[model samples]
Target chain A: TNPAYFPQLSQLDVSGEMESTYEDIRLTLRVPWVAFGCRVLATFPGYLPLAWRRSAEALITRYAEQAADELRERSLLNIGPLPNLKERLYAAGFDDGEIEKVRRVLYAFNYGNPKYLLLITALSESMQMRPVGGAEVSSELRASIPKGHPKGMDPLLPLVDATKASTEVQGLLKRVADLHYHHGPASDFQALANWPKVLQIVTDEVLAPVARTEQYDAKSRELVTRARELVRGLPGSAGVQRSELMSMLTPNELAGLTGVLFMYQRFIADITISIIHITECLDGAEAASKSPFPI
Target chain B: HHHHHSSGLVPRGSHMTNPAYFPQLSQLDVSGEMESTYEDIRLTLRVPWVAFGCRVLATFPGYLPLAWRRSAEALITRYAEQAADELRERSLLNIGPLPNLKERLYAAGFDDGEIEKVRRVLYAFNYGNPKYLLLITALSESMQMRPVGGAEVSSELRASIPKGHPKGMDPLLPLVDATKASTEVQGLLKRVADLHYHHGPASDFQALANWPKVLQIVTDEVLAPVARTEQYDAKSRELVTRARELVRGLPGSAGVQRSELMSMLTPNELAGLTGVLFMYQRFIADITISIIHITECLDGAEAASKSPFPI
Candidate 1:
């Protein structure tokens, strides 16, 4: 080897027999936040670097919380599959291969496979009919107290009102489970957004309302507050000796006790509200979406 | 007049200052074999005395939270292995990291490999991508024996983990929750950790494995901590025991805590441990702007250096 400049010449151009390979990299796995920013930039790269940096910064700050929340729910279940989605996909004449190929792609993309789940949810929604038992001679008519208040003569209003409230609550509860299994597992909806809108509309219009009102009630709110304290606190807050006993296990197990019940309180109430809204949508009432779950 | 006539009425002042000089000693002597040879001196030194000189120190306050505070644990974590090594280089000290976490069984006695494994495992996670790294660090450091039954660490050694932690020491910060967790969701609260561990290409741990086995090791050893009393839990010592059990091998780490029973018969132990936790730092990018996205506009100068926090 010799120290030399290019054109002016050197003693020797030695060649080695050994083979070597280099990485001709296709793409770099970037910082997650930066990667997200790049995706945004892909659409908005026309902007100046300064503008791009600002947008990236803004995007980071904005998504940080949302990302945390989404990941928080990531392990909510160890469920094998969304049984309902599987059954529906099966019924739609989709072969096992078709179904699994769709699922595997989504899975590799990670849970919350945005495109696939959304499309599935959508199709499920659009195809959704009122539950077999739901369509009726008006819930009020069904709950019409046999011969009515004919024994009392005009029990008309009270009997009809009771029926409407009972059936509406029941219906909302049923659809809440059906509709919002989750937002599209994919981002911004694509082939994965397979489901129709009917299911979501039912949930959004009916169950969401009922759930909200239930949350707003003073007693209901108190129950949730109480449930959390009892569930999360009972293990540790009870005392140290017992707390240490609980330590025979792990904190996550304890968090499991607290976290799940909290979710149940929140999710269940929301379902009721959603059911109420669906009933109203059927009746075409202006305030149907705003109605409360029955007393 | 009073100042001028100092002898008559002036008050004396105390003035003390060090002169600016560097003194060089011509000769120095140190006795190497004096202490060990003097039995009388040694006996006298050991006389009815516990620690002498600066013996008293404030104890590390107990943290009641189940999840150990990363910062507090860092007080001990950053240096425990080194401290343990220092104590053991003479072999008399016998201080080192618990090799297999087997307090009961001696076969799982301390191994240099375990200490290295812990150091590597603890360092693998980035507090950002996988906030669980903090949790593991916290667990690893705090799951320590809290100086009881005459096995207490020396106060001076304890100081190593404290602020006055001598010249060379390591440490963690209980960064705000907003900075720590990747998710607040209950079931899947941020365990993937990080691919790069918040370091750049120059970092020794710049990249890591995304292998499922690695992930399994992480959840088993680092992230998951242990299979808890039930489910949905934070880190615990018992859980760490489980983690220690787990990364050894998955299936055998199944029902029991000490797979040492299993370790004796298992020929493939090293292979199993090596395969899993080694690659526990893999991650893929997440791209989703679906659902509820709120785009905000703000007023800030270009280059954004003109704004508050630097980009």
Candidate 2:
């Protein structure tokens, strides 16, 4: 078998059942782009659909939303004294409408990131033969929220492809990836790249000082730890154990899937702090802490 | 300084018409001495990869190793580095007020960070491109039975920079493969190759193809108006002339004269090698100016008009 490529199955490349699964992922999670980890997981035969199907019910509930909000509340890097991005953007010649367009992109990622963190954490924990969601919880928390795109959210939000992007935009994406120490730019960063200047300002002024710091890594780890705990109270079982998947996947595919799951736990956590920190810079702590797309 | 010999040299237009006829030996396929020579070239130049010109030259039997062995000492000097810096400074097209790339990117919705990122790529190319012009010009002039590296010059300039890639540079400079590139990138490379009247795209163009939008702007807006003009040709000739003079002051002799290599290569291979060298001398010169011009657009003349990686 071929050594697995980390980046696999982009949204544009998927078709048939995989395409349908990707769509379900977006609609159920209410995200614009599928998480990078999910796409990598999709490369392993019968893995993503199996893992996602097992977790989707737990993920779409009121409890999941509340859990994501709790994670967001804890996600702040708290790197003191953010610049007034609104004033700075205006000084840099951006208008209100352009800023609003940028705000929408930020909000989209802010909404989706914590949910992804929870999903990946549960999957990661379960794949390692750890229990997820066998704890007692109230019945009200178990009920699924309304499915499909959130009201006021753009279903077709644009995420710039780094390869096809202008040099300036490509640079910004790379800088953000470098700061986060990621292999590539996250979907959140790509979505932000649509307003390249705003992405630039936020990256330099907002994210740069705080990203990948001791405090930041600690907070990111805290979210991962909390998410692992929260998924245990997920009100329903989520994620399949590795033992159940041995017959379905080749040794390499299983190993690849496990690695992707382990990586995305940290990846989503980094994005969680990053996007929230960006939102905090723009709209203050109160606006950043709450769910961006409220139920 | 003038050492013109007309006889036994291949004329310019003999076999350059068919693009398919030219073959390049890839860096991956080299073995034994050729492989070690490739390593030596990379170290002495302090560059990540060998240029496409040298790779193509390698297709001719015993050509690259001989040419490189003869030239390595001269190229690794501080004088060679500074001469390349001077050529880089002179490479800007200076056609008009450049399009204010930062403003343009901003107007097109790019931020400071994005523009800065683009600047780094431009800077990286800006750093290495003139060094290429110097190498090819020295080789091209020498192969044509012209004088190289025997002139009296200052000892200070003859000192060498430390070998290996300079700090803050990418260890491997990524170049897009023309055959495997996306349709858009293929079209961009083809346009540039056709524009330059070359057999295929240069390594510089392939590197620029990493950011297709920048490559597009460069091909259409930056290069279209000034490429191959009398003024541009004058500039290229100036680099060629200056490079020939600069190599003359090298600490050791550089490059092989055609007569010395006649026994090792067939007449047709010699002809092809000469023609290829001639083409690349101008091609690298054109790219040198074009990349610096793009750098000027993003960052101003102060940043554009210098060696980005100074010895």
Candidate 3:
């Protein structure tokens, strides 16, 4: 097997599938390259942010889920699978007061839109950073990357010369970058404005496939099933449908399972990048302090 | 000038990584895991306070103003109404200035007319003592209980237009009410931040709960009026689902431990999570209870009208 297998792409195997021409907005559907609240867009030398490590539970629902007792049973934290915060919020039919309470409580994403940009970086790194029009990454860069290594695998500035890539890829980058300007750290204004789309494809597209097992997912699903089964016996859920009661999975568990998918997506997406965005932001605090340029 | 003896305390404006400053704890690496208990929490709580102070010294931008505001708010509330009025008159705690807490707290440090940085930090840090929490918290409760008494929900006109507020702030106003994408996102971020700090960190929980006030300010001021978007029939089904989830996390909660104070956290975590765990459990329980109360009230009009917490 090659040394550069990405987990996400290998599992999802979304390479070569043409980009969906229908305008797919952020948080609309299941995104492959995503990791937790973040997406593995593209990385620098080697270290890209992993799903659970950098940002956990971008959605307030995930927080509520992690805080849920169900997650504690499994000894894991749950962040959602979706990119946008709205998906979870909308699902709960949760009103703004609840949303605002959550916003004010956990995830202190205030000041700049650092949270969203960070997720964008996450997506870039994990999704194999492929060109949107099914173009593959250069073999040299692919050979250099190691399993779970975030940085050196991605080109330092692949998106900079992305004029040759498909328009679908470019538009996504420009629009998302614009969001960064609106919400990101004021200092990050220019970089986000010029942000290029880090193309994403599956892990299987680049690296060898990871073993498909249901250890974590199946067990978590079963545990919730059991818990809810017990709840239904309490007369509260007495007449509830087995399927309805099965909604017992905590938001995090659901999110964690989804993250497994993202993990698979990003691990592969890292390889396909012909170029990587200049992620001064992804670099630690020391590097962040060094750059004085507008972006 | 003669060099005075060195002070044991680290100087204010020093880098955290500098060996000269953080001689202690900088080198200590964890060796092994012990039985996790309430005693095992890593002490990172004081770091934020130290960081906030350094920020004030490094950039005189709004940092001092915030510290001063928090200080002045605490101080004025501690004194009787007359003394507070006097302090305000003397400009020690001015209310009308931009980031008005600046003028007030600075006045305390700088006397009636001139303000200095040295005394401002010292006075605010020391004067704003912990006991002030009782007063502010009491005041906050009173406002919650008697919504019409203060600027809570009923007292302020939900429809009023204030200059800075642009619209009006009404606590009862919802988050989804936000008409603009920017405002909607802002509300989401604020909710996220609130959730982050509300529990677990025993120190910050005190600073939380008051977040409702902050949220109310945002809703009434920034967001455009939104039509009530709730559907009763759908809400009933959702609440039922929520009620079931709460039961699973309760004391009989199948986990590592089942102490009354610890039923909220996982059994393994609860042993050590006991600290500041009270406030969080309180928040969760209260939130759950609030949901129950809402369901009861939603069941009928008589409950809603006669219910005290519903309003």
Best by lDDT: 2
Ranking by lDDT: 2, 3, 1
Clash count per candidate: 53, 4, 76
Q: How does the DockQ of candidate 2 come out?
A: 0.01
User: What is the per-residue lDDT of model 1 for residues A60-173, given as tens digits with 9 covering 90 to 100?
Assistant: 221221322232222122212222444444565667776554433222223112111211111111111101111223333223112111121111111111112344432432
Question: For every model shown, what is its TM-score relative to the native structure?
Answer: 0.18, 0.49, 0.19
Q: What's model 3's lDDT at A150?
A: 28
True-structure lDDT of candidate 3: 0.22
Candidate 3: lDDT of A204? 16
lDDT of 2 by residue, A1-295 (tens): 0101124577898987888889999999998888877876776678788888899998988899899989988877667788787889899899999888888888888888899899988887776555788677778888788888877788867767766677688678767875775545788877877777778888888888888666786686578778978988887789987667766764334433544565577778988898888888788988888887888
Model 3: residues >4 Å from true position, as ranges?
A1-295, B1-311
Highest TM-score: give the candidate number: 2
In model 2, pairs of residues that clash are A196-B111, A197-B110, A197-B111, B149-B248
Model 3 per-residue lDDT tens digits across residues B55-77? 11112112222322222222222
DockQ of all models, two decimals each: 0.01, 0.01, 0.01
